[PDB]
Amino acid sequence: SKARVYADVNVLRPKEYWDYEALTVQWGEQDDYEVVRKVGRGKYSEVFEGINVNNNEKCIIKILKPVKKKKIKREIKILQNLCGGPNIVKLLDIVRDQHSKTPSLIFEYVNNTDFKVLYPTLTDYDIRYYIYELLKALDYCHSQGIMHRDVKPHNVMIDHELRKLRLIDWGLAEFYHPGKEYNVRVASRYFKGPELLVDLQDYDYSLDMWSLGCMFAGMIFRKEPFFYGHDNHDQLVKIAKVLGTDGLNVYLNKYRIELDPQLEALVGRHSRKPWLKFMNADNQHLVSPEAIDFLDKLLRYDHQERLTALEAMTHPYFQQVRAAENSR
Ligand SMILES: Cc1cc(O)c2c(c1)C(=O)c1cc(O)cc(O)c1C2=O
Ligand SMILES: [Cl-]
Numbered sequence: 001s002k003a004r005v006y007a008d009v010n011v012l013r014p015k016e017y018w019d020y021e022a023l024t025v026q027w028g029e030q031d032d033y034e035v036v037r038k039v040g041r042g043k044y045s046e047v048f049e050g051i052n053v054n055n056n057e058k059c060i061i062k063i064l065k066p067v068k069k070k071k072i073k074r075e076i077k078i079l080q081n082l083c084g085g086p087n088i089v090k091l092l093d094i095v096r097d098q099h100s101k102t103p104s105l106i107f108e109y110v111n112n113t114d115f116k117v118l119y120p121t122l123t124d125y126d127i128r129y130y131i132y133e134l135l136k137a138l139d140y141c142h143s144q145g146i147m148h149r150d151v152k153p154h155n156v157m158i159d160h161e162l163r164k165l166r167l168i169d170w171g172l173a174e175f176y177h178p179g180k181e182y183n184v185r186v187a188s189r190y191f192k193g194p195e196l197l198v199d200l201q202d203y204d205y206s207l208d209m210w211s212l213g214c215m216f217a218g219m220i221f222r223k224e225p226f227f228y229g230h231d232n233h234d235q236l237v238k239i240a241k242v243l244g245t246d247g248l249n250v251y252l253n254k255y256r257i258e259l260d261p262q263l264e265a266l267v268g269r270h271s272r273k274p275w276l277k278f279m280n281a282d283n284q285h286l287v288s289p290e291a292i293d294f295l296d297k298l299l300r301y302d303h304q305e306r307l308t309a310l311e312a313m314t315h316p317y318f319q320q321v322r323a324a325e326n327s328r
Helices: 069-082 115-121 124-143 206-220 232-243 245-254 261-267 289-298 309-314 316-326
Strands: 033-041 045-052 057-064 091-096 103-108 156-159 164-167
Touching: 033 057, 069 091, 069 103, 115 156, 124 156, 124 164, 124 206, 124 309, 124 316, 206 289, 206 309, 232 245, 232 261, 289 309, 289 316, 309 316
Parallel strands: none
Antiparallel strands: 033 045, 045 057, 057 103, 091 103, 156 164
C-alpha cells in the first residue's frame, strides 16, 4: 500500500529533513521559563501554563517523561519542520534540567477550552468551522510528509472565545516513507483506524482521516466517543457493528490480511447500518444530508478510499466556511 497523495515528499527532500535520529539538540536556558500552573498530563508528558521571564509573555511548558531519545528527537524535528503551518502549535524553545536531564518543550501560549464542556455547546456552524480548521492542519502536515497518528479531541486545542484552533502533541507523529512498515500501536483506542486494528503496518496519512471521521461522528451525533470499545479487539467489533462485516471481508481480502480466528469469532456477522439509525432528538439537526455524506466518505475500512484532507476541505458541507473566509 502507498499514500495516494504526498507519497514522495520525503523522497524529494534532503535526508536532513526527515533523518531525525541525526538531530543534535541546541538546548536553551531552562531559567527563561517558570511554571505557573499544571494544565494537562498524559502517558508521556506533563503540561503547564508557564511564563517567559524575559518578556513576561505566557507560554506552554511540556515536560517530557522518560522515553527513548529517538522519540524525543522525532517530536522535536517534526515540530521544527511544521512550525509556521496553519493551526500547528508553535515550538519556540527547548530546554532541560542539568541534574536530571529532564527535557521541556516550550510552545506558544494556547488557551484551551475543555472539549468535554465545549463540544455540547457547539452550534452546527461551529462544528463545520472547527473541523475545516483542523483539516488545514492535517493537509499541511501531510503535505510536509508527516502523519500525526494521534488525532483526537484531547489533541485539538480550541480557544472558543477567539475561535483559534491548534493541533497539538506531535509525540506520536512520524515521517511518511513509501512502503515503510510502521508500529500499529499509535492513536488513542477510540480513534484507531481499522488498519491499526488488523495489523496493516504499511499505512499512511489516511490514518488521520479515520481518526478525524471518528471525531466528526462523535460531534454531529453527540456521542463521545462514537466507537466505544474497551480493548483493540472490541474496538474492531464496535466498528464492524456499524460499517458491517461484508465491507471488512472485502478490505481484508484486498490487502491479503488474515484475521485471528479469535478476533474473527468475536467480530461475527453484521449488516451495514444506515447513518440515520443514530439520529435522535439531541442531534437530529446536526445530522444534515451533507454531514452524513461527508462522514460516510471518511469512515471507510479501506484507507485508500477515504477522502484526503484536501478533498475533505472542498466538500460542500464546508461551503459556508469557505465563503466566509474568502470574503475576508
Ligand atoms: C490540557 C492541555 C492544555 C494545553 O494547553 C496543552 C496540552 C494539554 C497539551 O497536551 C499540549 C501538548 C503539546 O505537545 C503542545 C501543547 O501546546 C499542549 C497544550 O498547549
Ligand atoms: Cl526550536
